[PDB]
Amino acid sequence: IIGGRESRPHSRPYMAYLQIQSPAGQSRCGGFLVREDFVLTAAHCWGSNINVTLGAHNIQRRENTQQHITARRAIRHPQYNQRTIQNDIMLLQLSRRVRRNRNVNPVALPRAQEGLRPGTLCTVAGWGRVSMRRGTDTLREVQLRVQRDRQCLRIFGSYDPRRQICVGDRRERKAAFKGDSGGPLLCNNVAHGIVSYGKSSGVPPEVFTRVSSFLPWIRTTMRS
Ligand SMILES: CN(C(=O)c1cc2ccccc2cc1C(=O)[C@@H](c1cccc2ccccc12)P(=O)(O)O)C1CCN(C(=O)c2ccc3ccccc3c2)CC1
C-alpha cells in the first residue's frame, strides 16, 4: 500500500496473507475470507503450495490471533490469461475450516453484476510494498477513488469494464502496489475488487478484478 496508514489491528478480520511456494519469501500475496473454508484472491498468485495466515496484523510474528491453514485447492478461473492478465481471480479451498471469531471472519461480497460509479471512495488493504524500496510487516490501507473506465481503457491494453475496475486518482500518491495483489477493495464495506495490477511505478490508475462479474463461478466452485 502506497500513501496509506497502518490499519487498526484486526479491523479487517477477513484479510488473508498468502505465501506462495513453500520457500519462505518465494512469493507474497493478499486475499480475503469469503466463507470459513474459502479465500478469494488473484489467479496470478497461483502456486503449487500456498500457506494461508488469517487473523494477523504483523505477519512476521506468530501472533495468538493467527490461524495457519494451507490451500487444499488453488482454483484458478477457467479463462484466466496470464499474458493479458484477464480474469485474474482464484478461489482457495482451505485444508480445514477456520474457527470463526472476532479476528477471523468472512467479508460481504457484492451482488451479481453490481457496478461502481466513478468518484466513489473505496479502501484497499494489504501487506504489500509502500514504495519500491520499502515493505511492511503490518497491515496497511488507503482510500482510493474509482476512476472512469476510459482512463484504464487508454493505459492498459486488455481492460474490460465489466470484469475489471479502474481505480486511483493519478493526482495522488495512493494505491495498492506489489504484494497487495489478491487483496480486497472495500467499497461501502463490501469487497467489490481484487488487487490485480498496475504500472510498476505504482502510479494510478490501477486495475482491480471486479468480483461482481464472477459470482456464478464463485457460487458453483464453493457449492461443492
Ligand atoms: C513490476 N510489477 C510490479 O511491481 C507490480 C505493480 C503493481 C501496481 C498496482 C497494483 C498491483 C501491482 C502488482 C505488482 C507485482 O509485482 C505482482 C506480480 C509479479 C509477477 C507477475 C505478475 C503478473 C500479472 C499481475 C501481477 C504480477 P505481485 O504483487 O503479485 O508480486 C508488475 C506491473 C504489472 N505487470 C505487467 O505485466 C504489466 C502489464 C500491462 C501494462 C500496461 C501499461 C503499463 C505497465 C504494464 C505492466 C506485472 C509486473
From Swiss-Prot:
Localisation per UniProt entry: Cell membrane; Cytoplasmic granule; Secreted; Cytoplasm, Cytosol
Induction conditions: Induced by the Td92 surface protein of the periodontal pathogen T.denticola. Down-regulated in monocytes following M.tuberculosis infection and exposure to bacterial lipopolysaccharide which coincides with increased M.tuberculosis replication and intracellular survival.
Catalytic-site annotation from UniProt: 44, 88, 181
Membrane topology: Peripheral membrane protein
Record Gene3D superfamilies: Trypsin-like serine proteases
Superkingdom of origin organism: Eukaryota
Catalytic reaction equation(s): Specificity similar to chymotrypsin C
Glycosylation sites: 51
E.C. numbers: 3.4.21.20
Any one GO biological process: immune response
Residue intervals of the Peptidase S1 domain: 1-219
SUPFAM superfamilies in alphabetical order: Trypsin-like serine proteases (SSF50494)
Pfam families for this protein: Trypsin (PF00089)
InterPro entries cross-referenced by the UniProt entry: Peptidase_S1_PA (IPR009003), Peptidase_S1_PA_chymotrypsin (IPR043504), Peptidase_S1A (IPR001314), Trypsin_dom (IPR001254), TRYPSIN_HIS (IPR018114), TRYPSIN_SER (IPR033116)
Important for antimicrobial activity as annotated region, ranges: 1-5, 77-91
Described purpose of this protein according to its UniProt entry: Serine protease with trypsin- and chymotrypsin-like specificity. Also displays antibacterial activity against Gram-negative and Gram-positive bacteria independent of its protease activity. Prefers Phe and Tyr residues in the P1 position of substrates but also cleaves efficiently after Trp and Leu. Shows a preference for negatively charged amino acids in the P2' position and for aliphatic amino acids both upstream and downstream of the cleavage site. Required for recruitment and activation of platelets which is mediated by the F2RL3/PAR4 platelet receptor.
PANTHER family (UniProt xref): CATHEPSIN G, KALLIKREIN-RELATED
Family: Belongs to the peptidase S1 family.
Name of the featured protein: Cathepsin G
Originating organism: Homo sapiens (Human)
Lineage of origin: Eukaryota, Metazoa, Chordata, Craniata, Vertebrata
Gene this protein is translated from: CTSG
